[PDB]
């Protein structure tokens, strides 16, 4: 594999390890991966990080009662661009009624970009992904990893 491909694999490994840990601990999380539609307008609403990705940094961002935990992390390739970002809220009727703002924000950004957003529920620990206006819930660890690899 090329350096670009190896870097992508390392970033996938960092994301999945972080998400798997937050799911086990019921740590709510909202992580949007920019794709070909630029998300600068949303990145600029958060706290700039421009940080190398690591599982450790991803988890710490979302620890409850901390400055960075409310709002979305937006990643650009192999960097965490910003945290505590605003995303627009979807009004889609296909969002389970019991779900809160993180899931609605994820679907919302997925309606106006080609990004992939991962959500961890603080209520159940369930992991979901929003893409192209659809929310896919209750993902296994294997399914999430495959989704990211395909992305």
Ligand X SMILES: COc1cccc(C(=O)n2cccc2)c1
Q: Which is nearer to Mg ion, 84 or 116 (CB)?
A: 116
Q: Does 83 bind its own copies (CB under 8 A)?
A: yes
Measured CA to CA, the distance from residue 111 to residue 6 in angstroms comes to 30
At its nearest, how many Å lie between ligand X and the CB of residue 50?
18
Kindly tell me the sign of the dihedral angle through the C-alpha atoms of 58, 64, 68, 73: positive
Q: Does 55 bind ligand X (CB under 6 A)?
A: yes
Integer CA distances (angstroms), 1 to 8, 27, 151, in order: 10, 34, 17
Q: Which is nearer to ligand X, 59 or 147 (CB)?
A: 59
Quick check: 147 and 129 in contact, CB under 8 A?
yes
**Per CB under 6 A, which region of 59-67, 101-109, 116-124, 128-136 contacts ligand X?**
59-67
Quick check: 10 and 106 in contact, CB under 8 A?
no
Contact pick of 7, 68, 89, 147 for its own copies (by CB under 8 A) = 68
Binding positions for ligand X, rule: CB under 6 A: 17, 21, 55-56, 59, 65-67
**Which residues contact Mg ion by CB under 5 A?**
138
């Amino acid at each position: 594999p090329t350096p670009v491909e190896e870097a992508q694999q390392k970033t996938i490994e960092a994301i999945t390890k972080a998400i798997n840990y937050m799911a086990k601990r019921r740590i709510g999380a909202l992580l949007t991966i920019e794709r070909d539609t630029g998300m600068g307008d949303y990145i600029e609403t958060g706290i700039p990080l421009n940080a190398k990705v690591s599982s450790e940094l991803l988890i710490n961002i979302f620890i409850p009662n901390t400055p960075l935990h409310d709002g979305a992390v937006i990643m650009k390739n192999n960097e965490i661009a910003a945290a505590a970002c605003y995303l627009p809220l979807s009004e889609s009727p296909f969002i389970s009624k019991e779900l809160g703002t993180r899931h609605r924000a994820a679907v919302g950004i997925s309606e106006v970009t080609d990004s992939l957003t991962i959500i961890v529920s603080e209520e159940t620990g369930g992991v979901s992904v929003a893409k192209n206006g659809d929310l896919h819930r209750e993902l296994t660890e294997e399914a999430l990893k495959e989704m990211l690899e395909a992305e």
